[PDB]
Every structure is written in structure tokens, then in C-alpha cells.
Amino acid sequence: STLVDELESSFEACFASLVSQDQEEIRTGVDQCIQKFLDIARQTECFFLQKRLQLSVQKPEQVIKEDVSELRNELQRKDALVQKHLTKLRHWQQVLEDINVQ
Amino acid sequence: ASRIEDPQIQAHWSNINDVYESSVKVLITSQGYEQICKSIQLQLNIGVEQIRVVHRDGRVITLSYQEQELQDFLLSQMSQHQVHAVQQLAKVMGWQVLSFSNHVGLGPIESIGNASAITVASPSGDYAISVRNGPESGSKIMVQFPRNQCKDLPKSDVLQDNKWSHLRGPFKEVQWNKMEGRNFVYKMELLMSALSPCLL
Amino acid sequence: QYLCQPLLDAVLANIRSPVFNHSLYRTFVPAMTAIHGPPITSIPSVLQGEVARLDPKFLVNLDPSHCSNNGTVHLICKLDDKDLPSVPPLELSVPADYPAQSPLWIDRQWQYDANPFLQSVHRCMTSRLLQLPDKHSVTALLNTWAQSVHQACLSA
Amino acid sequence: DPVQRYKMLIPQLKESLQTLMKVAAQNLIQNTNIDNGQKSSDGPIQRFDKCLEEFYALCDQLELCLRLAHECLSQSCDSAKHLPYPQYLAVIKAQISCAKDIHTALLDCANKVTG
Amino acid sequence: KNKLFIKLTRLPQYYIVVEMLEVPNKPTQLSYKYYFMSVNPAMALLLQQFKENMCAFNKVLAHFVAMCDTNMPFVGLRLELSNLEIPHQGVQVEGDGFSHAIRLLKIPPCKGITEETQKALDRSLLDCTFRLQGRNNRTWVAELVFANCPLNGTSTREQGPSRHVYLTYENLLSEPVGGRKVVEMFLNDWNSIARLYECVLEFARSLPDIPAHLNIFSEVRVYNYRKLILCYGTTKGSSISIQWNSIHQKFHISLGTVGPNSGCSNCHNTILHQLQEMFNKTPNVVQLLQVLFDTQAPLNAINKLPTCFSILPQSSTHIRLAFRNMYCIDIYCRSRGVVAIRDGAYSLFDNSKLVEGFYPAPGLKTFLNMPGLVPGLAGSYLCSPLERFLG
Amino acid sequence: VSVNLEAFSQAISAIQALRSSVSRVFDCLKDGMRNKETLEGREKAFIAHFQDNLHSVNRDLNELERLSNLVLYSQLLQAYKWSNKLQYHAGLASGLLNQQSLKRSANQLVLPPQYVDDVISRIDRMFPEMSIHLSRPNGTSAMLLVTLGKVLKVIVVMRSLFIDRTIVKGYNENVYTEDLDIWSKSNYQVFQKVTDHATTALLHYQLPQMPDVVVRSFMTWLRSYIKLFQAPCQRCGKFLQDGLPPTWRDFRTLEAFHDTCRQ
Amino acid sequence: NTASLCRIGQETVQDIVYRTMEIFQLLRNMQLGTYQDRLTKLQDNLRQLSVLFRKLRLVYDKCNENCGGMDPIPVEQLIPYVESEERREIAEVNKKLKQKNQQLKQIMDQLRNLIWDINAMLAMRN
Predict the structure, then answer these.
(1) E-chain residues within 8 Å CB-CB of D61?
(2) Which residues neighbour E146 within 8 Å (Cβ) at sequence distance 6 or greater?
(3) Chains near C, with 3+ CB pairs < 8 A?
(4) H runs (alpha helix) in chain G
(5) Residues of D near F (CB-CB distance < 8 A)?
(6) In angstroms, rounded to a whole number, what is the distance separating the alpha carbons of residues E365 and E386?
(7) How far apart are CA F219 and CA B144, in angstroms?
């Protein structure tokens, strides 16, 4: 029931030992809470991946919009990088033109 | 880098070189899973006549000035990184790795590189996947459906109980073509989610 | 040995006395229960598994034709593979107490004759049974049958 | 003193075990002789119960001594691990109190966010 | 005299011999013959030849080398399984083409386990497939698949009647991949699984008839066939774990706190040894739940005392509390929520003081809160809380 | 001292064991013999269990004798205990959670030279056997000469607070000491294999963001090469082929290994 | 739209565990000025973590309430076994990025040649 609630409860339980009012006890406790949190996190990831697979196999247009946006962002990033490189190149060109003199 | 685009390729040439030596840092990642897919990395030493390769697994190989040798070696390394990607994905997903062989010897005699092999099981028992990639013949994935689920296996009268009708059975193959995602790891993750609990 | 011996000697004296426990019981009931307190608050399964874990090439079944259900378990399985097959029945008699008395294949040469391919598969599979180790399993016979058929294919 | 007491009780504990084993053997032999047909003297006998309680009493005294020594040693090592002395204890208690405030803050926030 | 010796570094003593011969018709070609040699002043043992199946890769050579390196580790495991009278199927090609596996049929039943539990286990073991994995190819994994699980857990383990447990073994660097220690550890884990299946079967049989307080007090959480994690408490916070340690041949219980309401500990860590011995003498879990439900309430009060007061753990339900060095008191917990307190230093026999001595001056305070040392009882778990600070 | 604390903790368990073992001998005797399906079996079972119980009492008593030879205010102690508890708990939790990380991608250099110098000096402070000489002959890219005893002379080539190339050389060999011999070989096959293994360790120890623990682990792994020519193959004898003991030291396990043997 | 909200939900659940790991590391590094910095860092981490809970919750509600018309096919019935203007925009963007990548490859080749030349000259000058 609302795996979000169960993962919240496990994240609370991982803190339920220190936040309260020898080594083996804390050892086994952290083992249990951490492994439970990891399992339920991997399960929520599996649910999200199933939803993605269904939406992609039945509605393959939003993925195309995502590819378009990603390609445009990549092009903008490349343009910005080449602009910065050109600025540095012009700076170093002026610096080298200053030297070499007598 | 331009021709082969599926797994990845990367190169970071060193800052200081010499007149009789140089060095690069080759990395073969995946498109989306950069973090987990960091198992194969190379450090080439381009000498005057020989190229020395130092793999991350402690394997040193002295190549030649010939161009093909390097191409075939990089293709075999990509083929191995392909199965290492499935291994590292089955770790994060929690798919128990049943078997893993870096150089398998069963099957068709393969090309320049030896074939790789992995077989993982679903966390909830019944389902299981197997992957065999190679430089010449690769992407041979087949899912292991459970018995009493295909309904096409010939029954036997020797089986007189219903307890034996739960084992993973008919070994159905899956077409890697006409699939979703974009990278081998995307399709592997989508197939793993398809064979998941479907809690929705 | 040390510090315990007379107790040892005492109990080693008094085994096979019929009244024994009671004497123990009596002298040991009160103090303990005072101190610690009150008391406390058809077909064998191995063959079925071997069948369940076969390769889908085989379709093993029981044998109601010959005299059975008194001695061993007789099986006519099949050969269902893309490679062409040797005569399918290969009747196998798995005796009781499976982890011993390795099963024997009841030979049927008349069907394997009248054909060169069948004679070759018979010869090679028989030789491969000769080279098989002692106490072989059913899966071993099935696999050597398949590989012998394949050898006959590749030879001719 | 704690190590010395542990040394003092160990010979007594060996003696108490010897008597408890010997008394048990005498009692079992007399009870078997009465239960089967075998004449035996009434004698002093010595009760098994009294010996078994004595052994337990010595065991508690030893455990109490060791538990105190272990607690005292653990406290001393921790004290060493953590100019005027009053200001010294003041800054120690201040650090401990601020750590406790951090504890309470993290606890209340992680418990109010969910559950 | 023109031959190459390709030694296998992972599995030693095995040498491939590749000899080259001149072909008569073509003076510009060669023929390769591959032999499988083995060594024990080196002494050869046997020789066999495989003869069936850019141009400088010699595909068949690498293929044969990989095939040998992948197959030979299984031969030692097969020999070790045959030497210990363990009926096992031969090395078979798995359904997914490329593989090797050794599926066991029957295990040696057990030592020290009842016959009916042995039958219940042998009728539930579906498969014992062994497989090889790991870098250098020296890790083994056995996947046991049991059916008809006795009792489920709170986790998502209530699926179809097929529970899959994976047991991994990695032998040392020496003691080559096929050895005795792997199957020995496997048999040890199987024995522990059987000795735990004893208790799980007892608990599954006793589940229909429960005193109706332990049912709400305790709940089963996970069952991985090698550990039993029961959880008890009013808010289901505390947890006890059952496991059989084959090294010591005794049950090992581990206590923890998993729940968003509890003290600073499981509150039962002061009676851990007596509970260990109690479960070791009589392996029954319902008695454990009962004694835990009976002793938790007094323990929650006896744990909060200032640590002056010293807690000496005696036998179960007999926790002892002592003063700095001259006073004592015995805590006798019983069913129906009652605790009987005693004078302490007093002796249950002839009136002489113990080593601690110093007869408690009062003792009538305990009377109004609930010679003259016989029995002070009838505290209904509230006196057990107030009388702490009062005394 | 800590050794005394452990001896007391072991002794407390030994007293508990002696009391439990003595109770077991008497408690089992009270139950007495069980049927066992056979006359011989029942007699043998009772004798075996009693003898094991009697022996356990002797073993537990012996340990206690042997262990004798070896050995506003309360809130402060509460704070100390909670600090120790949080330290242990957070350490275990961080270990267990960074061992298994679910991060799959990043998308959802410039560094001060004095900072690199400080990091190198901090690393040189520990490992007193190793001596690292900082030098910048060519640009901000630093070159480190690391002397390990009379054994090794490693040439690390930093491009940033990052390890790029390593060439170990022998102690008697000349690094030329001046404008640094970055490009050369050791002329001995053992040191060449050690250079290969050092490049392998570099490719292995690669943390994504933090550039300090990588150098820490590299220096720690190099320090393991101080027992070279003196330690076994833990699978092989001292000279497996003729390369020395361990051209290889396992990462996560500073054990010697021959490259020909494995790892 | 929904297929991107699902990727957002994926990245949120992939990042929450990393945030908890960073919180654990911060509590571990907290041994007894700097205390104020550690406290405010922990508080900011907790606030961003609660914000991540809210975000993952809302995207969960969104993907659950969406349930588009095209979902009658259950899972395992979708995997393929053996036995318009958007595409034009994709092709145009592909051609553009291909040209830009060829130009960037030329630039990288020139830069590598420059660096190799400078290194060789500054090495041989000695």
C-alpha cells in the first residue's frame, strides 16, 4: 500500500536506533534496516522502470520529444564550450602577439 | 568512435608526451549508465614501434604497428564491456548472478575476440535471463520462463505431482531487434522491469 | 577426569538398574527446582526431479506396454531436436534405489538395422555407453544418445 | 583488589566444584542402594542442595567483581579519550550538550518529515 | 620438434601441446595438431588429442583454450562429489547453450535429525544446481529451490510455492577450485538448514493453536532457510534472530531493535546467555515467545535503573539486582504478570549471611509497595516500576 | 589498557559458561535415559552426553584459571556513550550504504597548486619510510619522486591533483636527479612489471570526485612494495618463475602474488 | 510528458538514496564554528530531502492518475520474441549535429596536433 509510505517508514527505522531516549546489536540492526531500505528502493526503481517501459512501448512520442530536447541541450552546451574556447584563444593570441617583439 | 556508437568510447590524451612515447586513457562506458559501467579501462603506451596495453584486470598486451590488431582488440574489449554492463546492472537491480564467464568455450567458434557469458536470476525466483555477446555473433539473449506458464511443453506421465510444475523451464528466446530504449543497458533494464513484480 | 570422576564412577556404576532414573530424579529434583525454579514455560522423487530438470528436447514418459510396475521403471522418452534423430523409444529401465545400479538400455537392434544411418548411430551410441563411467545417470544416457546421433550426422 | 579478589575466589570455586561433585556421587549412590536392594549406613550424608547453592553463590560473587572491574576500566579509558579544571569540565559538558542538541534536531526533523 | 606448450595458469598441471606440421601439397601452409597434456623432473601422465570442431588469430586455438579453462574446474568438483557418495548428474550443457552445471539428485540425508523431518526436507528439495562464476573462475554457487514453505513473512515473500536460496563458496587461492572444503561447507550449511527446519516445522504445526496473546505479541518477518527473524513488542519494534552455527554446533540468537518506537536497546540483552542456553537445551520457539512476553515488562523497568545499582544476570527469570557492595534482591518473574522479590543477601536455608552479607535494614517497604524474607510477591508490573525508585 | 579490557570481558563470559555448564550436567541427569529404539543406543547416548557435559565443565573451569593470569555528572557519561554509539552506527551505515550505491548517472579542471602541495605534504607526513620530493619542472603539472627504502624509486607524473603516469626505478639506478627523467625504463624486468602493476593500480584506484583518497590509496599500495624480494606467493613459493615474489599485491588485500601465478 | 515525468521520478528515487548516504557520512564525520557549519549542512540536507519526498510523491500521483487510454496490454505480452513531421525534425537535427560533430572533430584534431608539436619541441629543446 503506497510503497512510498513503506520506504519512508524504513528510512525512519534506519534512524529509529540512535534517535531514542554492544557492537553486535547495532551491527545487526543496521544490517536489517539498510538491507530493507535497499530492497524497497530497488523495488520502487523497478516499478518506475515498468511504467517507463509501458509508456514507451504504447506512447512512443514523448520519448521522441525527450530526445529532441536532449539534442538541443547538447548543441547549446557545445556552442557555449566553443565560445569559451574562442575567448581563451583570442586572449592567448593577443598575449603572444604582445611578446615575440624586441 | 564514429562508426561504433552502441556501448561507448572515450580517450584522454596525456598532457606531457615525449619524442619516442605517448599515452592515452581509453574508457568504454555506456550511454546512460556511466557510474556503474566502469569496469573496463585501458592505458595505451604508443612506443616507437609497439603499442603496450595495460588493462584494469592486470593484463599487459604488446600490440603491433598494424592498424587491424588495435581495431580487433578494441572490438573484443567492447564485447566484454557489454557483458560487464549486464553484470553491473544485475548487481544494482539485485538480479542474483547465477553464472559469469569472461571467455566462454561452448558454442560457435568465434572471431577475433572470445565470446562472453552471463546468466542472472530474477529476485523473485522463477524468472531468469542469459546474455552471450561476441565480436562477430553477439546479443544472443534468451529468457527462462517457468514451467506451467508456457503451456506448450509436452507433459509426461512420470510427473505425477504438482510440486515439479514450478521450476524454470522452456528457455524462450527474445529478439533484441525491434525493442525500446537506445543502448544495450536501456533494453536490458526494460527487460528486467518487464520480468519484475508489476506492482503498479 | 579430574574433579568430576566420582560422579562419573557413580553413574557408571548404576546404568542398567531398572529403577535408575527415579533415584537420580529424587536426589536431583528439589534443589534444582528450588534454585532455578519451576520448569519450562509411486515413482521415486529423484526420478521426478531428474525429469523436471531435463532439456526440452526430451519428452520422457512412462511405459505401459511391457511388463512393468513390478520391477524397474521403463521409459520411452523421445528425440525432438532440429538435428535428425535416431529411433525415438530408447527404452530405459531405471531400477529402484536410483543412486546405485545404473540404469540399463534394453537393446532393440531390429529397428536400428535395415538402415545405414541407424546402424551407425547404434554403433556409436553403444561405444559411448562402453566409454561411459560406472553408476551413470539417465541424463548421461540421454546426452550421449544425442551426441552420438550428432556424430553420425557429421560423419555421413 | 578486583584482580586480587578474582585470584582469591578461584581456589574456593575449584574446592566448591569438588565438594558438589563428591556430594552428588554420595547422594546418588545412597539413593540407588535404597532403591535397589543394598544395605548402606545413614551417615552424615551432607545435602546436595546446600553444595549446589554454595557453588552458585561463589559464581555470582566472581561475576559481580569482574563486571565492576570491566565497567571501571571502560570508564577510565573513555575518560582519558575525552587551564583551570572547572572551565575544562565546563567546555566538555558544553560540547556534549551541543552534540545532544544536534541529535535532538536531526531526530525531530527526520521524524516529522515522515512518520 | 616444432611445438608450443600453452600452460593454463588458472588451473595448473594442465598443458596444451600445439604442434605444427608441413602440408605436402601446399609449400606455403601449415597444419596444427592440438593435444591435452597433464603433468604431476616433471612427469607426464596422459595425452589425448582433440580432432574435430586477417588469418593470424587461429580461432580454434583460443576456442580450445577457453573451453579447457572453463570445463576443467568442473571435473574436480565432479570427482569430489563422487568421492563423498553424493549422487550427482554429470556435467551437462545448460539450456542456455553456453554453460556448465552439476545438478545434484539426493543429498546425504543428515546426522542428528529426526526421520520425519528428513522426509519433509527430501520431498521439498526440487533442485540443487551448482554453477561457476567470478573472476579467475573460482566461485561456486548452489541454488536450492524449496517448495511448500511452512510459514511466510511480512516482506514480499508470499509468492508462489518456490523459495530460491543461493549459497556461494569461494575456496582459498591455494587448494584448487575443485576440492573437499567446498562440498564440506555445503554439507555444513545443509545440516544447519535442516536443524533450523526442525524448529520452523514445529512452529508451523503450533501456529493453528496459539495462546492468543503471542499471536498479537509476536510475528514472523523473514524466512531465508538459514535465519529466523521473529519480531515482538507492543509496536513490533524488537527482533530476535535464530541461526545454527555449525562451527560450534549450537543455536545462535541475535537480538536487535527494528521499529520506530523503542528504548536504547532490545531490553533483553541482559538475559541473552540464559536464553541461548534455554533454547539450546530445548529447541522450541513458542517457549521463547512466552518467556519473552513474560519477562519484557519487568526488564523494561529493571533496565532504566541508574548504573550504585548492579544487575547480576542469573538463570532465566531470576535476574539479580545489587547495591554498591552490601545489599541484594532477587527478581522472580512468573506468568500472569507477577514478580516475586526477595531479601537478596538472605539464604534460602540455615540462617547465615552470604559473602556480601549486610541484611537489608527495611524489607517492609517492599511489603507496603506490593525471618520475614520468605516471599514478597504479587507485584502486577506497576510496583515493579515504582518500587525501583522507591527502594 | 585495551588488552586488560578484553581479558575481563572474556572472563565474564567464562564465569557465565561455567555456571551454565554445571547446571546442564545436573539438568540432563534429572531427565535421565531416553528410549533411543535400542538397548545399546540408549546406553551409549546417555554416556556420550554426560561425558560431553562433564568435559565442558572442566574446559570452562580451566579457562577461568588461565584468564586469571592474563588479567550533572551522569549526563556527561550519557553523552560519551551516545557519541560512541553514533560513531559506530554511522560508520557501519556509511559502509553498508556506499558499498551498494544506486547512482547510475551524473547528468539528471582548475585547482590551486598550493592545495596540491599541502595534500602531498600531508601524505608525506604519514608513511615515514616513503619520502616524496615535489618538483614542477614543466608547468603546473607536478612530478613526484617517491623513494621507498633502498627498494624503489617511483616517478609519479601529476597533471593536476590526479595521477597520470608512473615509472618505478631501482634505488641504485639513476633518475638523473635533474631536468627529472620522466621518460625512461628501469632496464630490469622486475621493475618493468612493477611499473605495469602500478599503472594497473592507477587505473583501479579512480574515485570520481574526491582527488585525495585516490592518492592516499596509491601511496598505501606502493608502501606494500617494501616487503618485495622478501615475501611469499600465498599460492606459490618465493620465486614462482624468476620474477620476485610479488610483482602483484591484491587491491583491498595487501598480499604478495606473482603475475604468472594469478592476480 | 508522462514519459519524462517517469524519468524525473526515476532520478528522484535514484538521488534520495545518495542524499541519505551523504547524511550518514555527515553524521559519521561529526566528531563531538565548524559545528555550526555541520548543523546547517545537515538541516539543508534534511530540507532538500523532504522536498525530494514531496516531488517524488507528486510525480507518483501524476503517473498513477494519468493511465492513458493505451494501456490494455499487461506486462510480458509486449516483449517482441522471435516467433511523420517529428521524424523529419529528428532527421534535420541529426544532420545538424553530424555537421557540428565533424567540425568539432576537426577542431580536436588540430588541437591535438598543436599540443603534440609544442610538447615535442619543448622536449627536444633540452
Answers:
(1) 355-356
(2) E124, E125, E126, E162, E163, E165, E225
(3) B, D, E, F
(4) 2-29, 34-66, 85-124
(5) 3, 6-7, 10, 13-14, 17, 20, 24, 52, 55-56, 59, 62-63, 66-67, 69-70, 73-75, 77-78, 82, 89, 92-93, 96-97, 99-100, 103
(6) 12
(7) 47
Q: Which of residues 49-78 of G touch D (CB under 8 A)?
A: 49-50, 53
Q: How many CB atoms lie within 10 A of CB F59?
A: 12
Resolution in A: 4.1
The pairs formed by E312-316 with CB atoms below 8 angstroms and a separation of 24 or more are E312/D60, E312/D63, E312/D64, E312/D67, E313/E270, E313/E271, E313/E273, E313/E274, E313/F16, E314/D56, E314/D60, E314/E274, E315/C35, E315/C36, E315/C37, E315/E274, E315/F23, E316/E271, E316/E274, E316/E275, E316/E278, E316/E291
D111 Cβ under 8 Å from any chain A Cβ = yes
Set of cell numbers at residue C135: 553408476
* Smallest Cα distance from C89 to chain E, Å: 22
Q: Cell match 517524488: residue?
A: G56
**Contact (CB<8Å) A19/D110:** yes
Q: Residue D30 and residue C23: Cα distance in Å, rounded?
A: 9
Q: In this structure, are residues E231 and E238 in contact, taking their beta carbons and an 8 Å threshold?
A: yes
> Pseudo-torsion of CA B49, B54, B59, B62, nearest 10°?
0
CA-to-CA distance for C139 and D28, rounded, in angstroms? 62
Calpha distance E31→E50 (Å, rounded): 14
The Cα–Cα gap between C45 and G69 comes to 50
C-alpha closest to that of C54 among E105, E80, E147: E105
Q: Do A59 and G70 touch (CB under 8 A)?
A: yes
Closest C-chain CA to F53: C4
Q: Would you tell me how many other CB atoms lie within 10 Å of the CB of residue F115?
A: 12
Place of cell 526494460: B190
The reply to whether F77 touches chain D by the CB within 8 Å rule is yes
Contact across the interface for B160 and C42, Cβ inside 8 Å:
yes
CA distance, residue G100 to nearest chain D CA (Å): 48
Which long-range contacts link B196-200 to residues 24+ away (Cβ below 8 Å)? B196/A46, B196/A47, B196/A49, B196/A50, B196/B122, B197/A43, B197/A46, B197/A47, B197/B124, B197/E156, B198/A50, B198/G74, B198/G75, B199/A3, B199/A43, B199/A46, B199/A47, B200/A47, B200/A50, B200/A51
Contacts of B174 in chain A (CB under 8 A): none
Shortest distance, CA B175 to any CA of chain G (angstroms): 5
d(CA G18, CA E384): 46
